[PDB]
PDB file of C-alpha atoms in Angstrom:
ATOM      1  CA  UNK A  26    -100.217  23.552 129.147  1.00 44.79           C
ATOM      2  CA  UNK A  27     -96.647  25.014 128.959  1.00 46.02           C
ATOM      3  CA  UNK A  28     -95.994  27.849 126.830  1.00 49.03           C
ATOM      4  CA  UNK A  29     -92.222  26.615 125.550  1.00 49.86           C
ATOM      5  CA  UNK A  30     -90.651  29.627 123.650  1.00 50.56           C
ATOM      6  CA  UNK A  31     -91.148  31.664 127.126  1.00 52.71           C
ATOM      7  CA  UNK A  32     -90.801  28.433 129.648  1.00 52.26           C
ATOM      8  CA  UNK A  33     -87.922  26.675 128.157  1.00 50.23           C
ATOM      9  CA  UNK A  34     -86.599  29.239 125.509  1.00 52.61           C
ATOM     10  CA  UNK A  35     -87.106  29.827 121.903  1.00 51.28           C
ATOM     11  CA  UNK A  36     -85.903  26.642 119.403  1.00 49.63           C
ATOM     12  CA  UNK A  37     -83.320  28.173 117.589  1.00 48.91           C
ATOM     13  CA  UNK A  38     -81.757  29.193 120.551  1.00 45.40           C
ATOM     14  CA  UNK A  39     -82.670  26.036 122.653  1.00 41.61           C
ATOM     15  CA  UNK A  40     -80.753  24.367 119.559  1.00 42.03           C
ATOM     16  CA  UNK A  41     -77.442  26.340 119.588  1.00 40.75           C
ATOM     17  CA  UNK A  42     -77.483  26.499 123.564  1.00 41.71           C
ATOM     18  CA  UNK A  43     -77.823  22.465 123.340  1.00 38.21           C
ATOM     19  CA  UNK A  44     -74.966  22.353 120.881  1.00 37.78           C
ATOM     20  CA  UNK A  45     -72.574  23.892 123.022  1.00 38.32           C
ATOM     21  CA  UNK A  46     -73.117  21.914 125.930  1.00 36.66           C
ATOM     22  CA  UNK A  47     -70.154  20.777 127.410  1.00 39.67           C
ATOM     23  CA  UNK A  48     -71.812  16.939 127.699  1.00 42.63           C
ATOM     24  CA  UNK A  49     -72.181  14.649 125.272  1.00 41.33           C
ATOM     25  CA  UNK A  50     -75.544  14.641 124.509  1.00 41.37           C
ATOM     26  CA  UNK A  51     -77.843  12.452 121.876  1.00 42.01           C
ATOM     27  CA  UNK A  52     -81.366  12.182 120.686  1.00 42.43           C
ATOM     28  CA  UNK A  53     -83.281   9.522 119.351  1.00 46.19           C
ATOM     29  CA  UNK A  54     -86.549   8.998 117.380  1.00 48.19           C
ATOM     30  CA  UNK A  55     -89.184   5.820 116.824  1.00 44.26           C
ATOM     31  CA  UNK A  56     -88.706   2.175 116.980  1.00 45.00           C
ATOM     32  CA  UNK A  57     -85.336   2.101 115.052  1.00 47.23           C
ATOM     33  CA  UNK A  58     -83.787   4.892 117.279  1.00 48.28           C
ATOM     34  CA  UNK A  59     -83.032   7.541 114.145  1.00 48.19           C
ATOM     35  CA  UNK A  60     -80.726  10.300 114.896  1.00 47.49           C
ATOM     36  CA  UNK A  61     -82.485  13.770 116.198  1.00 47.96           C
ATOM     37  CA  UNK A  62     -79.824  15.809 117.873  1.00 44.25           C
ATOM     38  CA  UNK A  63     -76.452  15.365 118.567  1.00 45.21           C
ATOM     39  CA  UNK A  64     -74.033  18.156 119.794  1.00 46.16           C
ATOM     40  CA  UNK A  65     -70.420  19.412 118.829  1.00 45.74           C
ATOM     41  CA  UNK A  66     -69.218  16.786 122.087  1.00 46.00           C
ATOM     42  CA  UNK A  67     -71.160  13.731 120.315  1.00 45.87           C
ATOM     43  CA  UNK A  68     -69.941  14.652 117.007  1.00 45.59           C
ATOM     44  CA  UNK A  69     -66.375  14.533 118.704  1.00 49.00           C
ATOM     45  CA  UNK A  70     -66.237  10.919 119.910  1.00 48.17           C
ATOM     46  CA  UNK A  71     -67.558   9.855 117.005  1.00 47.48           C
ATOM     47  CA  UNK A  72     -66.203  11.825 114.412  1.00 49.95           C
ATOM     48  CA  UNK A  73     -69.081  10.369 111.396  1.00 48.42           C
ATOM     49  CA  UNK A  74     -71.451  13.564 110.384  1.00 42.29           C
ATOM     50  CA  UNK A  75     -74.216  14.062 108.529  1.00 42.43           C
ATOM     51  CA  UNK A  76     -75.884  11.874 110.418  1.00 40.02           C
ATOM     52  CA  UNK A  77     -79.162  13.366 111.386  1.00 37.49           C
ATOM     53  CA  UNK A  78     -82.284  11.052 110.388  1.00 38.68           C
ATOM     54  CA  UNK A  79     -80.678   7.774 110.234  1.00 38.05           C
ATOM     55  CA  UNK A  80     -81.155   4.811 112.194  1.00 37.96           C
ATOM     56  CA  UNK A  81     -78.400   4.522 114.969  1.00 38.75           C
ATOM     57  CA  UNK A  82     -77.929   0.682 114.027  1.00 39.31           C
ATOM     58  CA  UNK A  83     -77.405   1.660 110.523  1.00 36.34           C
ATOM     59  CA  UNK A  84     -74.612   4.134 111.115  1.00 36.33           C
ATOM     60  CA  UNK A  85     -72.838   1.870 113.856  1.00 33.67           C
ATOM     61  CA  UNK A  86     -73.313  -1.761 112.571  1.00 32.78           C
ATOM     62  CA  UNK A  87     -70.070  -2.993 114.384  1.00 32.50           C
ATOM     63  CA  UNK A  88     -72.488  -2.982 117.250  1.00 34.08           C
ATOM     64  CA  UNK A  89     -75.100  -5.164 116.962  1.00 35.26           C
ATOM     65  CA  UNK A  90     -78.476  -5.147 119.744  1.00 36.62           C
ATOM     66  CA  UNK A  91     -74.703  -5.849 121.901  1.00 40.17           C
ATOM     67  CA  UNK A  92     -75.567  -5.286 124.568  1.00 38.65           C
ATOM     68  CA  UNK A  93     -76.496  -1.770 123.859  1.00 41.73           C
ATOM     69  CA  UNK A  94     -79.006  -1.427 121.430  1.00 40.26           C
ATOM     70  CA  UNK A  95     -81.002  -3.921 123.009  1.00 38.85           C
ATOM     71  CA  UNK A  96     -81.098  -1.680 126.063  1.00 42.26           C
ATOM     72  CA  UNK A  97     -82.482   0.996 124.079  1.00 43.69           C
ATOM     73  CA  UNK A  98     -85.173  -0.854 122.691  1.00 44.01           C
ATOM     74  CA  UNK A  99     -85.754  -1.909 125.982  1.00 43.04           C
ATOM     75  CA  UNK A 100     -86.374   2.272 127.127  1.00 47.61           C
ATOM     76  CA  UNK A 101     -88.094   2.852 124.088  1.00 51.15           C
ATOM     77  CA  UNK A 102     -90.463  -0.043 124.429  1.00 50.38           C
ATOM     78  CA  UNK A 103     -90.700   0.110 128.236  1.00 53.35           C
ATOM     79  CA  UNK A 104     -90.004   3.224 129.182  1.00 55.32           C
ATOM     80  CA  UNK A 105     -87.511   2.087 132.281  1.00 52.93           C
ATOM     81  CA  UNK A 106     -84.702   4.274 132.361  1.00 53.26           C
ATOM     82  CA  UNK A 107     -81.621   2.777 131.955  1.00 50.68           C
ATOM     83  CA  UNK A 108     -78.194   3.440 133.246  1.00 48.16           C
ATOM     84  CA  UNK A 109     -74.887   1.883 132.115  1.00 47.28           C
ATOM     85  CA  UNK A 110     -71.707   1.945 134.075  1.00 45.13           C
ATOM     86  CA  UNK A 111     -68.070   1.988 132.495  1.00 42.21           C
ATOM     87  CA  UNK A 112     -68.811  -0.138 128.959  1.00 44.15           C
ATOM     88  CA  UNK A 113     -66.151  -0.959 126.883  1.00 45.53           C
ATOM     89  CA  UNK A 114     -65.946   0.516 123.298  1.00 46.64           C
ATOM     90  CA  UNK A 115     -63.321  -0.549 120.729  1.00 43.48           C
ATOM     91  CA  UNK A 124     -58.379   2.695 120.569  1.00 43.75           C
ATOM     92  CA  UNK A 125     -59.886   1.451 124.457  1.00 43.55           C
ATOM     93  CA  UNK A 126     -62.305   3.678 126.040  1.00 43.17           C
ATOM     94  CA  UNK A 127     -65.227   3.067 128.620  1.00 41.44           C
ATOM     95  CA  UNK A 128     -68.561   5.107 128.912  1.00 39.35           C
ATOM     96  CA  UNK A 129     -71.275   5.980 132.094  1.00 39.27           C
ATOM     97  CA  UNK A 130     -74.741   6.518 130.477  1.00 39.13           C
ATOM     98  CA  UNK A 131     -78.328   7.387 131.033  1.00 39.37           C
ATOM     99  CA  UNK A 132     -80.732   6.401 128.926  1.00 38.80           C
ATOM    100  CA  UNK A 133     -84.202   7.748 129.343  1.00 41.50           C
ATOM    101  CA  UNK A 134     -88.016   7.800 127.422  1.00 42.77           C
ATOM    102  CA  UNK A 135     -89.401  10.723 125.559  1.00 42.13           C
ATOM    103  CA  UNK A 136     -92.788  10.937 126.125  1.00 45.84           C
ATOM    104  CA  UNK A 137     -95.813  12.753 123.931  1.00 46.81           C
ATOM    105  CA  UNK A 138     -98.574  14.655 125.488  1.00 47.28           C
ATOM    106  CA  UNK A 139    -100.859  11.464 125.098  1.00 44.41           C
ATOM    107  CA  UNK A 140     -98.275   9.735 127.298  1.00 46.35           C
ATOM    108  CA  UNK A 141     -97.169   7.252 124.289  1.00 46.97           C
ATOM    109  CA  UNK A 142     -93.199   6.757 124.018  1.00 43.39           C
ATOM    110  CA  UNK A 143     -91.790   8.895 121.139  1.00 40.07           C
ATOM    111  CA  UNK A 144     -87.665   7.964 121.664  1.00 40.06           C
ATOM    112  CA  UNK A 145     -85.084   8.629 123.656  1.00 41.93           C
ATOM    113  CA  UNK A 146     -82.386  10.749 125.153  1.00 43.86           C
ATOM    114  CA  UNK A 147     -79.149  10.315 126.799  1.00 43.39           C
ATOM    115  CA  UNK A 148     -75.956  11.831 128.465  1.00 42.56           C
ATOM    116  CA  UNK A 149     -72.666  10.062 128.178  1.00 41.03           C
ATOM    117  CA  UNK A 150     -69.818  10.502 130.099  1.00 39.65           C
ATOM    118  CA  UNK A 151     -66.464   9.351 128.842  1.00 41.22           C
ATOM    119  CA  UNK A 152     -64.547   7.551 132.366  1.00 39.25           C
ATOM    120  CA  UNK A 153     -61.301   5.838 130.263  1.00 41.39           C
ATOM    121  CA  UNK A 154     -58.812   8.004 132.570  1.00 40.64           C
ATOM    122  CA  UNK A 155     -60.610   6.724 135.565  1.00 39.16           C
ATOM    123  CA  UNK A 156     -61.144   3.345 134.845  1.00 39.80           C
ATOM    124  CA  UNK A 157     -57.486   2.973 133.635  1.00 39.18           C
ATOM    125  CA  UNK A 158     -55.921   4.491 136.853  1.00 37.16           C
ATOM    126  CA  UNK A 159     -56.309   1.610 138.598  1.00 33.63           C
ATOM    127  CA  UNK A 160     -52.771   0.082 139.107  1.00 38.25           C
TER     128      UNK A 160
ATOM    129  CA  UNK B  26     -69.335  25.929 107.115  1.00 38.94           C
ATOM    130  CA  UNK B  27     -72.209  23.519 108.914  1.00 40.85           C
ATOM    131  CA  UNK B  28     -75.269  22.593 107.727  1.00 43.21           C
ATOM    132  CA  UNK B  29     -77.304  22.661 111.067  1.00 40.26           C
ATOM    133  CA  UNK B  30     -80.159  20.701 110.636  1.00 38.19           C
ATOM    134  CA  UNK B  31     -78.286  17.778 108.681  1.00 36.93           C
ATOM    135  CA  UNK B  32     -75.562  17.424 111.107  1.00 35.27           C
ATOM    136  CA  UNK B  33     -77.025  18.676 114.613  1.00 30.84           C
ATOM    137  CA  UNK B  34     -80.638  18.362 113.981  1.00 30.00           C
ATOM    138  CA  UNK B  35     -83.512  20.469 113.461  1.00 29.77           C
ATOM    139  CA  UNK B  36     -84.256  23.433 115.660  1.00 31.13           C
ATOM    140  CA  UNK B  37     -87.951  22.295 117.356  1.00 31.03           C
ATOM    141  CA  UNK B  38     -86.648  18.395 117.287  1.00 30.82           C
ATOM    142  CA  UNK B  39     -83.357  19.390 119.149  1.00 27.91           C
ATOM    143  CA  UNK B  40     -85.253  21.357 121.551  1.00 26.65           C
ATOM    144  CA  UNK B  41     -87.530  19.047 122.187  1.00 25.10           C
ATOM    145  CA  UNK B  42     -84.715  16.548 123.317  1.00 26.07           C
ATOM    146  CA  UNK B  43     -82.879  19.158 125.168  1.00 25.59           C
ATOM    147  CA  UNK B  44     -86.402  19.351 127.441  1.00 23.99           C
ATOM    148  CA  UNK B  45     -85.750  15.885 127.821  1.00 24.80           C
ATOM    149  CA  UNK B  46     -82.122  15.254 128.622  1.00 23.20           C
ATOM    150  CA  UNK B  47     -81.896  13.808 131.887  1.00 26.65           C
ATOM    151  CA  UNK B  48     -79.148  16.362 133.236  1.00 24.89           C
ATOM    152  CA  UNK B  49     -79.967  20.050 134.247  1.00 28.65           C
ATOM    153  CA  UNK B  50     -78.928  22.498 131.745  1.00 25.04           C
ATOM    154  CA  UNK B  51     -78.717  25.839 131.300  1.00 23.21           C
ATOM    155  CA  UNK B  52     -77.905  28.411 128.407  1.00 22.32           C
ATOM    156  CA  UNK B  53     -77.386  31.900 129.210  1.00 22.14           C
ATOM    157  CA  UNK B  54     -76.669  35.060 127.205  1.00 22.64           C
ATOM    158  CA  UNK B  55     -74.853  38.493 127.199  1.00 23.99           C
ATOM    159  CA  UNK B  56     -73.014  40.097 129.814  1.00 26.02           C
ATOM    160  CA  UNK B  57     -75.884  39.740 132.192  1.00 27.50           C
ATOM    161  CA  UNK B  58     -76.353  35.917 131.925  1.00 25.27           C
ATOM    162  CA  UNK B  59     -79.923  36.312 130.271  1.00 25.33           C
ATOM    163  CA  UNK B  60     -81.634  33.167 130.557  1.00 26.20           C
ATOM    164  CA  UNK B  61     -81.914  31.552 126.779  1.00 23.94           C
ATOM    165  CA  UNK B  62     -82.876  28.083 127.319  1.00 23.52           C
ATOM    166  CA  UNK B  63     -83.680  25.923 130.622  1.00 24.67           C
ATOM    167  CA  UNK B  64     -84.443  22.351 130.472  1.00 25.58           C
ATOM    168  CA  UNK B  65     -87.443  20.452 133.046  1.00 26.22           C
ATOM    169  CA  UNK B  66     -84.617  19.150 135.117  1.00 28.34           C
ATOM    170  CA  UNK B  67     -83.272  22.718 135.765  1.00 26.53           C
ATOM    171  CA  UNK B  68     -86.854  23.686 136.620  1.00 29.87           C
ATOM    172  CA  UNK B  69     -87.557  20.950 138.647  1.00 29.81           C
ATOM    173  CA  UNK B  70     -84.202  22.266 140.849  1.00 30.45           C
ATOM    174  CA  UNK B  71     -85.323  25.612 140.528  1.00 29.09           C
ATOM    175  CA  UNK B  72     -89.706  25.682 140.384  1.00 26.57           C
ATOM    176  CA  UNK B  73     -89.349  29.561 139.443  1.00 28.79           C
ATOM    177  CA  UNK B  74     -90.520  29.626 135.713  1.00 29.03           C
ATOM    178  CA  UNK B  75     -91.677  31.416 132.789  1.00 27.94           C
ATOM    179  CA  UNK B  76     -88.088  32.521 132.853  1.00 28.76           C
ATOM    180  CA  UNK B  77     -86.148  33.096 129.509  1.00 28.44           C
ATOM    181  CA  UNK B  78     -85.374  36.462 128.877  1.00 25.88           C
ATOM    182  CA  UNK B  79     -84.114  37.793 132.284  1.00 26.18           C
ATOM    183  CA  UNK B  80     -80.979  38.625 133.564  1.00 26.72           C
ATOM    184  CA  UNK B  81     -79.825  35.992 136.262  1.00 26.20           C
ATOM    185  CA  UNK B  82     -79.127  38.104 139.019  1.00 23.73           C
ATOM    186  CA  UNK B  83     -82.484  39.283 138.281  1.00 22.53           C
ATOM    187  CA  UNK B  84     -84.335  36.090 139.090  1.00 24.18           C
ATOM    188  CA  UNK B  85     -82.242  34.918 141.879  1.00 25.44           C
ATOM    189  CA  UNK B  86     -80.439  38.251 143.933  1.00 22.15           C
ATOM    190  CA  UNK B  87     -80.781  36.250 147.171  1.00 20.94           C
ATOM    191  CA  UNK B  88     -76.907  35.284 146.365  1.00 21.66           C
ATOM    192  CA  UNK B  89     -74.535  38.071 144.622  1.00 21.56           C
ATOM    193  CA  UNK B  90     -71.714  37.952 142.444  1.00 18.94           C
ATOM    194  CA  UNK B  91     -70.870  35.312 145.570  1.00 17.49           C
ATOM    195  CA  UNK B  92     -69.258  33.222 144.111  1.00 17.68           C
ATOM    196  CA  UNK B  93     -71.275  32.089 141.350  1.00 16.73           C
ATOM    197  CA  UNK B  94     -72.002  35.276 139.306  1.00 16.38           C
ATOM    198  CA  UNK B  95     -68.446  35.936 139.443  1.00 14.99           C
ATOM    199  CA  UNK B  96     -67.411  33.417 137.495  1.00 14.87           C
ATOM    200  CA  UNK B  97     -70.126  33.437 135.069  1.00 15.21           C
ATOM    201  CA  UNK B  98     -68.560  36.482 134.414  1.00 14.16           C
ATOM    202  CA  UNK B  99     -64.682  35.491 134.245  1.00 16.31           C
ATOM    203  CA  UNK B 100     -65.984  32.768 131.709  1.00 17.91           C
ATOM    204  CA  UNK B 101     -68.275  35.486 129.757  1.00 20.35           C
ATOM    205  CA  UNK B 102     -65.346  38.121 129.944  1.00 20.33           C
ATOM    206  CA  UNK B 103     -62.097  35.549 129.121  1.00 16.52           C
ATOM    207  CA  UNK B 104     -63.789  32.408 127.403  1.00 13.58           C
ATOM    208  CA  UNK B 105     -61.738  30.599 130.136  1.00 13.30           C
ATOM    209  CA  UNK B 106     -63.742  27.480 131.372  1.00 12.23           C
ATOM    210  CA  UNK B 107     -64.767  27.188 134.931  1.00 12.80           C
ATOM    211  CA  UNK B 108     -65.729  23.904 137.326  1.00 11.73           C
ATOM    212  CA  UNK B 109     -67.024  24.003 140.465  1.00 12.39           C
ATOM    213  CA  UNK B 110     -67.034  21.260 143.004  1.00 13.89           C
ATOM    214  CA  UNK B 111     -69.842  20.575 145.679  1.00 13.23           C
ATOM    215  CA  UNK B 112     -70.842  23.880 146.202  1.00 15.65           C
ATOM    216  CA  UNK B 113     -73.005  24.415 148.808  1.00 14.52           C
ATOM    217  CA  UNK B 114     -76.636  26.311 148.138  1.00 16.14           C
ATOM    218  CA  UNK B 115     -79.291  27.262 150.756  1.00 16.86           C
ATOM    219  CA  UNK B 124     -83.128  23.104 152.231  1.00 18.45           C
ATOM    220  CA  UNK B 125     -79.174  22.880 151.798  1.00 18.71           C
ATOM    221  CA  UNK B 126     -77.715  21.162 149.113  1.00 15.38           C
ATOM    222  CA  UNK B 127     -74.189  20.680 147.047  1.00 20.36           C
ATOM    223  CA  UNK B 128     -73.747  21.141 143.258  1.00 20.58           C
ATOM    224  CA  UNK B 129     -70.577  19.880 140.839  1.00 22.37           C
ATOM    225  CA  UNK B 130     -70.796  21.969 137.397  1.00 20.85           C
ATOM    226  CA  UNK B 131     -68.848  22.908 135.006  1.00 23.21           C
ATOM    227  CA  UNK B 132     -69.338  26.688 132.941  1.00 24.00           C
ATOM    228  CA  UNK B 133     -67.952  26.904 128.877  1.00 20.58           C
ATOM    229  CA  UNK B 134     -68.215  29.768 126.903  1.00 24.39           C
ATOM    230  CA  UNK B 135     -70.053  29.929 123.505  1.00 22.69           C
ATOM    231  CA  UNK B 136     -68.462  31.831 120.830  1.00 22.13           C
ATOM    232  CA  UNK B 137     -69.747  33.668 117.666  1.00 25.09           C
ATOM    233  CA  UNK B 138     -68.486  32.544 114.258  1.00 24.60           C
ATOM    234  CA  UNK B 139     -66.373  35.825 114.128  1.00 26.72           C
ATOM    235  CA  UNK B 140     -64.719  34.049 117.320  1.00 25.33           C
ATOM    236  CA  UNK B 141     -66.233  36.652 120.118  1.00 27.17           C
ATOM    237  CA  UNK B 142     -68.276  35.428 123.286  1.00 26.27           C
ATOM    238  CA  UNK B 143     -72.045  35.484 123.063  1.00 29.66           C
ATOM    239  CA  UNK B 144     -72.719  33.803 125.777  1.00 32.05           C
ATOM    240  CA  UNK B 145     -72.179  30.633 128.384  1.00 34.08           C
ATOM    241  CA  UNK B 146     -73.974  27.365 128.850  1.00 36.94           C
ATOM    242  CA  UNK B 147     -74.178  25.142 131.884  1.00 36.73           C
ATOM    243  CA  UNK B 148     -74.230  21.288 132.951  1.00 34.90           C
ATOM    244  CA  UNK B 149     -74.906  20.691 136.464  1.00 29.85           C
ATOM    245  CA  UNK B 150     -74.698  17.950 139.051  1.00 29.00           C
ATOM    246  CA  UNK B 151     -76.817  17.783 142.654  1.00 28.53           C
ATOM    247  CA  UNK B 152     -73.998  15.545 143.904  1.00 26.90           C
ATOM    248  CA  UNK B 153     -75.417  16.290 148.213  1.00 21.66           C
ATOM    249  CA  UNK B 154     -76.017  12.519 148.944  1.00 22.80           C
ATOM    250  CA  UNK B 155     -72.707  12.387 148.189  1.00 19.77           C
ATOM    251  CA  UNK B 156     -71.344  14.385 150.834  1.00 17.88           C
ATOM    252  CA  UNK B 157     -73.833  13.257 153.395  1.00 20.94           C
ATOM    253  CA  UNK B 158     -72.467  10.549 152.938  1.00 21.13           C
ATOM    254  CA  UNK B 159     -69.812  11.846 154.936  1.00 15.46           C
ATOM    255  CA  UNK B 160     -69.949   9.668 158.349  1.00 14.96           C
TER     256      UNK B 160
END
């Protein structure tokens, strides 16, 4: 077994470290995908706070299991990673993504994670 | 001010998805880049553990202040960010990253964090 405050660093600081990442960077719990942990780049692109412990559907209804949500029901249920590649979100921007599982000691799915990467500027240089 | 664990999530929780986040990460501290918080993809790119606590330099002197320590630094010392592209690191490998300073509420630098990249099949790709 790992010892975590020693192997991967005490929670407090784990959490403030996490914040500060310069990534955006989301967490999500159970069947209906309820906020965990989102950091200060998250909280920028979508600038809706307070968010913690809701279910992600229920804060972003203009989505709708389209196509995205379906796709993390699909990790969570599964447990195949999945990977987007330049989506469109309505300004006009486009995302890269990774969705992966979150596993418990007894190997059962607990939610998901991912790292988003905002490409508009790339996508949009092409003349 | 923020309410933490409404708006970025509890401290165990967030940890817990930081563990998880399928990028490596890294959160260091103080003017000698103690190691605060390392997540299972960092340790599976680096199998030297039980780790927090120590002074970089300290768990890997086989490279000094070259080049890498010397800009932890210029980002600890000036809060100036700092990217690296496809840096080369003896198997032999090639890392993007990019370094970001985290600052106290009073505005002064506590520390830096880390995302990074193992981008080599990228440049062996280099026929």
């Amino acid at each position: 077994e790992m010892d975590w405050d020693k192997t991967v660093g005490a929670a407090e600081d784990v959490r403030r470290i996490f914040e500060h990442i310069p990534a955006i960077l989301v967490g999500l719990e159970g069947p209906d995908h309820r906020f965990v942990a989102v950091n200060a780049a998250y909280r920028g692109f979508s600038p809706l706070l307070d968010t913690v412990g809701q279910p992600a559907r229920e804060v972003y209804p203009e989505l709708e299991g389209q196509q995205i949500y379906e796709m993390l029901d699909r990790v969570y249920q599964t447990g195949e990673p999945q990977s987007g590649s330049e989506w469109r979100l309505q300004e006009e921007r486009y995302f890269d993504f990774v969705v992966t599982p979150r596993r418990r000691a007894d190997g059962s799915i607990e939610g998901v994670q991912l790292i988003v990467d905002d490409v508009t500027s790339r996508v949009r240089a092409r003349q």
